[PDB]
Structures are given as C-alpha cells and as structure tokens.
From a paper:
These four human proteins – [name], BRD3, BRD4 and BRDT – each contain two tandem bromodomains that bind acetylated lysine residues in histone tails, leading to the recruitment of multi-protein complexes to chromatin. Through this function the [name] proteins play a significant role in controlling transcription and regulating gene expression. This process has been limited by the pan-selective nature of the [name] inhibitors, as they typically target all [name] bromodomains with similar potency, hence specific proteins/bromodomains cannot be associated to specific phenotypes.
First, to cover a range of bump sizes, we included primary alkyl methyl, ethyl and propyl as well as allyl ‘bump’ modifications. With larger bumps, however, the rotational flexibility of the bump becomes important, with the semi-rigid 5 bump acting more like the equally flexible 4 bump than the 6 bump of similar length. Co-crystal structures of [name] [name] L/V bound to 5 and 24 show that the tert-butyl group clashes with Leu381, reducing L/V potency. As this clash pushes the ligand away from the ZA loop it may relieve the bump/leucine steric clash and increase WT potency.
Numbering used by the authors: 347 to 454
Amino acid sequence: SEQLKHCNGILKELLSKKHAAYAWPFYKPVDASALGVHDYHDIIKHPMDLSTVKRKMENRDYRDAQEFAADVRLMFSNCYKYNPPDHDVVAMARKLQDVFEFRYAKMP
Ligand SMILES: C=CC[C@@H](C(=O)OC)[C@@H]1N=C(c2ccc(Cl)cc2)c2cc(OC)ccc2-n2c(C)nnc21
C-alpha cells in the first residue's frame, strides 16, 4: 500500500544521519546485560528496536501502517516504562518520537 511506503520513508528518516545523535540507543535490541542491567526483561514484556522494525518492513511482516506505528510506539513506551522520567535516554526517545509522530501524521 501507499501507506506502508510512507512508513518505510519514516523508518529511513529515523535511521538517517540527521537524527543519529538521539536515535542511536534504538538502533539495535537492548542488550541489557551488557549494560549491567538485569531486570529489563522482567519489566519489559516485548522488546522492540529499529532493526526489528526494519526486518519486519523488509520481510513484509507488517499487515498495515497501524501495526508499524504500534511497533515504533512500543519501542518508545518500553523506554519510558523501564526508565525514570529524568533519564537522558528518555530525552532521546522523546526527541526521536517528535520525528516519528509528526511524519506519521502526514500519512496519506
Ligand atoms: C537497558 C538498560 C536501561 C537503560 C540504562 O540505564 O542503561 C545503562 C538504557 N540506556 C541507554 C542510554 C542511556 C543514556 C543515554 Cl544518553 C542513551 C542511552 C541505552 C544505551 C544503548 O547503547 C547501545 C542501548 C540502549 C539503551 N536503552 C534503551 C533503548 N532503553 N533504556 C536504555
């Protein structure tokens, strides 16, 4: 669909150089143990990240744009859920969600 196309564009923007300063925490799945964090998967039921979104997109695993949005939003929600509101990673999530929500709203 033309909506899934629009979403692919958004994904590419989220991955582009412009946003790399606050998008990077979300490039790959959280490796919590590597960060010295060992309850992440007790708190977070379903991990999400942009490489996963990209894999689904590439593999045509998204039934519609709303499923795409559900994943991206979940990626942010996990971050907000697990971390305190003053966390710098939360700031990064908010800045990147700035981008996502705005471009997603421009969807035909
Ligand atoms: C998993 C551990 C919890 C957070 C943490 O305090 O890690 C030390 C963590 N912080 C970070 C984190 C903390 C501060 C800043 Cl400014 C950016 C990212 C984090 C880092 C990463 O490096 C590859 C990848 C994922 C991260 N992440 C995401 C997504 N959600 N929370 C985090």
